[PDB]
Amino acid sequence: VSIQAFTLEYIEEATEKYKTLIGEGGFGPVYRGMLDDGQEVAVEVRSAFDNELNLLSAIQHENLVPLIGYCNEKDQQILVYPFMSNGSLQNRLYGEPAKRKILDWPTRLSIALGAARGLAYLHTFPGRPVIHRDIKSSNILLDHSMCAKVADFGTAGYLDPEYYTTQQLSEKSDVFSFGVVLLEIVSGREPLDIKRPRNEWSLVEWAKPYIRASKIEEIVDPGIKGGYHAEAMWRVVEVALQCIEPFSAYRPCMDDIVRELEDALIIENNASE
Ligand SMILES: C[As](C)(=O)[O-]
Ligand SMILES: [Ca+2]
């Protein structure tokens, strides 16, 4: 809840000399470490600011990756986040772990609502908005409790088509991108896959017809076939379609998405009990 300054020496002790590399992150590599109090951290090292730290200091929401501290020493720019032990939504949908454990519909729903709330907090931020501009399943991280934490708010298949007119990314561009994420969550497919039959190359182009023709069962992840209530799935698919409208003007705000995703989870929780 409060940002700390670390020394390079401390980051090296925690990181065991960058022994582990958690993965490619936005604006630098990210290594795994443990602080001397025992909490697991991810340490982002800028490849190549104090205003950014103040912005990141000002962002506080349960569905955003929080900043623990930073390192300023010797013209280095290091950022320290909690380690998210359950990894990325992308990985749990069609990653290696998806072959072991199938993420169930209610959990998928709960992760989407979490992520939407995080983005909603950023979009409606007092004074000026915070726009992510690179929303994707790999940037929706999961903690021990499978609570969504959106990352890299400091990609082909997700890019707002309208960007080719405006050459600008906006809240509405984040909304389009999120719509593609909702399609991943429903379908269990990555947006772009050349190895798929030609008609299935684009998840977005492939899906719209079936949704438009009210035949959602065809596009649903086999692992959650008969694992959802139709009323709840309709809501998610419907709002997903509005998000991926080629023209931002017809696209809902993130907060309309929050409400639809809340409605879907109340429908499932109601039928579950
Ligand atoms: C990027 As801001 C905290 O001025 O809305
Ligand atoms: Ca608000």
From TrEMBL:
Highest taxon, organism lineage: Eukaryota
Subcellular location: Membrane
Domain Protein kinase: 16-266
Record-given protein name: Nodulation receptor kinase
High-level lineage: Eukaryota, Viridiplantae, Streptophyta, Embryophyta, Tracheophyta
Residues of the full protein shown: 582 to 881 of 926
